[PDB]
Amino acid sequence: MELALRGGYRERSNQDDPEYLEMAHYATSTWSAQQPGKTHFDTVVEVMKVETQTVAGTNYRLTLKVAESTCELTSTYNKDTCQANANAAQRTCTTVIYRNMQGEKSINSFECAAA
């Protein structure tokens, strides 16, 4: 559930693999569903930075711009149907998704800066 190392992240391009965006939506929708007082999913406006660290498993550290979606938590999250309005408050969130060598992923951390 963790890969712990100081330094050793390598920047990757957000243009080079569609999985970074998929993982960003996974992390954002999953995290926001767990938050108190929340009525709607948060969604991913942009993957701003991608960095990865690998030993056997891999950490994906994604720096995201996130905003409240138009989808209620009582509905099923859909990445291409739950977009944020331009006037919704945006914030920067950083998430580390840990995927073990055998392909199982979890959200090791998800932290948002204030708007």
Side-chain angles (χ1 to χ4, degrees):
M1 56 174 56
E2 194 155 280
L3 185 173
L5 207 57
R6 302 178 97 106
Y9 270 103
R10 291 183 174 160
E11 187 169 14
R12 309 289 184 185
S13 172
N14 78 351
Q15 301 277 26
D16 282 354
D17 202 305
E19 206 189 14
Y20 304 131
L21 183 54
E22 294 172 32
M23 282 188 288
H25 278 283
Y26 149 77
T28 302
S29 61
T30 299
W31 173 88
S32 57
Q34 298 169 324
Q35 301 315 296
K38 198 70 170 132
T39 60
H40 289 69
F41 287 99
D42 284 335
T43 191
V44 180
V45 174
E46 189 184 9
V47 179
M48 299 190 293
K49 192 176 188 173
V50 179
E51 303 167 271
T52 71
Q53 229 181 11
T54 302
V55 175
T58 292
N59 281 337
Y60 298 94
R61 183 163 71 190
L62 310 180
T63 305
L64 308 180
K65 209 80 190 179
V66 170
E68 187 176 42
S69 86
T70 49
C71 293
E72 293 175 48
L73 290 174
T74 52
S75 72
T76 310
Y77 185 82
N78 183 335
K79 50 177 77 175
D80 41 81
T81 220
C82 292
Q83 287 188 9
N85 291 323
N87 75 349
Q90 297 176 1
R91 67 198 188 274
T92 303
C93 305
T94 304
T95 185
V96 178
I97 298 156
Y98 169 73
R99 181 149 57 197
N100 62 22
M101 204 199 57
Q102 72 264 39
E104 303 165 326
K105 68 177 182 286
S106 63
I107 303 160
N108 180 279
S109 63
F110 196 105
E111 305 166 5
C112 295

